[PDB]
Each structure stands twice: as C-alpha cells, then as structure tokens.
Paper text:
Our model protein for comparing methods of RT structure determination is the coelomic hemoglobin from the marine annelid Amphitrite ornata. Named dehaloperoxidase, this O2-transport protein is capable of oxidizing a wide array of substrates by either electron or O-atom transfer. DHP exhibits four activities common to heme proteins, peroxidase, peroxy­gen­ase, oxidase and oxygenase, with each activity employing an Fe(IV)-oxo (ferryl) intermediate. In this study, structures of a multifunctional globin, dehaloperoxidase B (DHP-B), obtained using several methods of room-temperature crystallographic structure determination are described and compared.
As well as this, we present an X-ray crystal structure that was determined from the same crystal as previously used for collection of the neutron data (data set NX-Xray). Following the completion of neutron data collection, RT X-ray diffraction data were collected from the same crystal using an in-house source (NX-Xray). The Fe distance to O-MPEG in the NX-Xray structure is 2.23 Å, which is much shorter than in the NX structure (3.04 Å). During RT data collection, we assume that the ferric heme centre of protomer A was rapidly photoreduced to the ferrous state due to the ionizing properties of the X-ray beam, which is consistent with extensive studies on heme proteins and specifically of DHP. This reduction could lead to displacement of the MPEG molecule as DHP forms the oxyferrous state. The SSX, SLX and NX-Xray structures incurred X-ray doses ranging from 21.8 to 83 kGy. While these are very low doses, small enough to avoid typical site-specific damage to bound ligands or proteins such as decarboxylation of side chains or reduction of disulfide bonds, we expect the photoreduction of the heme iron to occur after just a few kGy. For the SSX, SLX and NX-Xray structures site-specific radiation damage may also be a contributing factor.
Residue numbers in the entry:
A (entry chain B), B (entry chain A): 1 to 137
The structure:
Amino acid sequence: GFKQDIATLRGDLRTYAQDIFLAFLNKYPDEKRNFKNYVGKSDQELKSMAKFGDHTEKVFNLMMEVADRATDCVPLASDASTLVQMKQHSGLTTGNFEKLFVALVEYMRASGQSFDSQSWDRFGKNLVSALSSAGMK
Amino acid sequence: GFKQDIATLRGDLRTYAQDIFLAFLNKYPDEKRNFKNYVGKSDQELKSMAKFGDHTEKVFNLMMEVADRATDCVPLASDASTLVQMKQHSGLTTGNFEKLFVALVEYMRASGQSFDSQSWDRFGKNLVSALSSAGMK
Ligand code: HEM
Ligand code: HEM
C-alpha cells in the first residue's frame, strides 16, 4: 500500500524522481516555462543539468517525508504551511501541484509495479486542499 | 533530537551520504580495502562518479529506515539480521560498524548543525550489540 510505496520510491529515489518529474514536464509542456533553461532540451539533456538534478531530488526527498507523516493520505497542516512559505515557490498555484500528482499517478499506473495508485491520487488531492487552506492561490 | 535528525538527513540524503562516507574512508583508510572500486581516487573524483553517489544513497536510505524503526535508539532484531545476512557484508565484523559510527558522530559534532550526536552514539552502540546477537562476529 501507500506506506510500502514510500519505501519503494526511496529505494531508488534518484531514478524515480527524475522519471516522474520528466513525465510531468512532458505531459504539461507549459510547466517548463517556470524553469530557466529547461526549454529546448530533451530528457537526456535535462538529466545532465545540475539544477535539474538537484531540484528534482529535493522535491522528492521532501515529498516522501510529507507522505510519511500523513495519516490516511491526509498531510499534516504544518507540512502544507512549510510548502507555501518557501520563497522559491513565489509564483506557484495549487494547479502546479495538482498537475504534478496527475502525472505521478499516471506514471504509477503505467509502470507495471504494484503501487497503490488510488492512495497517491487521494494524497495529491488532500495536499492541494491543505495548500489552499494554508494560503496558496 | 534523533527523529528530527532523520528528517534533516533524508532532506538532503545524497549529499549527506557522500560526505559521511568520505569522512569514514578518510578517518580509517584501512577500511577502503573493502571498496576496491574506490581505491586511488580523491574526494572530488569519487563525488564525480555516478556509481559512488548511487551506492552511498542506497546504503544511507536503508540506514535511515533502520533508525526510523528503532525504539529509544535500539534497533529491531529483524533489521540487524537483514544487515548480517546481506551477501555484500560477508567477512565484515562488528568492528567495521563501530568505526563507521565513530566517524558519523565525529562528523555530526563538527558540522555546526544541531544534530543529537549523543543519540547517534547510543544508536551505533546498540546496533553493534544487535549485530552480534544476530550472528555477526
Ligand atoms: C512538490 C514539492 C516541491 C518541493 C519540495 C520543492 C522544493 C524546492 C526547493 C528545495 C527549491 C530550491 C531553490 C533552488 O535552488 O532552485 C525549489 C526551487 C524551485 N522550485 Fe520547487 N518544489 C516543489 C514543487 C515544485 C513545483 C510543482 C514547481 C512547478 C513549477 C516548482 C518550481 C520551482 C522553481 C521554478 C524553483 C526555482 C528554480 C528556478 O527558478 O527554476 N517546485 N523548489
Ligand atoms: C548501518 C550501516 C550499513 C548499512 C545500512 C549498509 C547497507 C548496505 C547496502 C544496502 C548495500 C548494497 C548497496 C548497493 O546495492 O550498492 C551495501 C553494500 C556494501 N557494504 Fe554496507 N551497510 C552498512 C555498513 C557497512 C560497513 C560498516 C561496511 C564496511 C566497513 C560495509 C561494507 C559494504 C560493502 C563492501 C558493500 C559492497 C559494495 C559494492 O561492492 O558495491 N557496509 N551495504
């Protein structure tokens, strides 16, 4: 289930983080514009870029902690507040996070591994809800 | 405390894993003989190899899972058994693990962060005991 999935992703986190974030950027090409120097690059070029590798690893390290601290796929309010107050996320909305979780769930369903994709769908919706209550537009 | 330390380390797992492993190898150069692929290389050469980062991240992820499952810094006997039965740990003794934790605690005390270095010292001692009880020489 959900708890074992966190363990599965952590076991190969660098690979999963890059694969899932690329799936997001390719499913929603407009989301590349939030990032500098991502446009015009294929996936293998992105994986060679320092800031891509560093950001995606930090995204997923923290996301797995938020998932780990949730109860029944509902995140702690404090984790939602933490994500809203990050200075780097100045011009983000919940829609950016919504789209990331649609791509993540789609990646899990296509993967052939036994992820609990329904729980991740719930987790993504509940995190978006928490982000809005914490102050994200 | 200890539980926050796990969250700090997991937040930047690949970076901490490499720096701590290098601190171990450089404090105890005899231990590098166990890692034939890493002999003859400086710190920056090792950090530039993908296989070094990949290995240290996987190892450190498992160490954090063991630490997370411990009670009062006492690891589960089942986790100690997993570590003893791993094929890559054939020929290791509890002395190798003791040296790892001396270097870990030294690294935490020098880092200038608010790690609970005393709890990690206790966890290392209790892990060494559990490894003996699970069959390690
Ligand atoms: C979901 C969990 C996320 C976490 C934990 C997270 C975390 C971080 C962190 C630690 C940084 C470091 C600042 C830096 O050096 O760039 C950062 C920057 C950044 N993040 Fe995120 N982020 C998340 C989601 C997103 C999403 C969905 C977007 C969508 C656009 C995004 C866009 C950015 C951007 C644009 C930067 C600044 C780098 C740049 O200007 O290209 N993040 N984020
Ligand atoms: C709590 C402490 C430790 C944990 C959780 C741990 C875990 C692991 C894991 C998961 C692997 C396989 C990694 C991979 O697939 O690349 C591994 C390999 C290995 N470990 Fe450990 N280990 C620990 C302590 C040690 C110590 C103290 C030593 C020696 C001083 C050691 C020596 C080795 C060696 C030689 C390998 C083979 C690496 C290779 O050939 O690629 N381990 N360990």
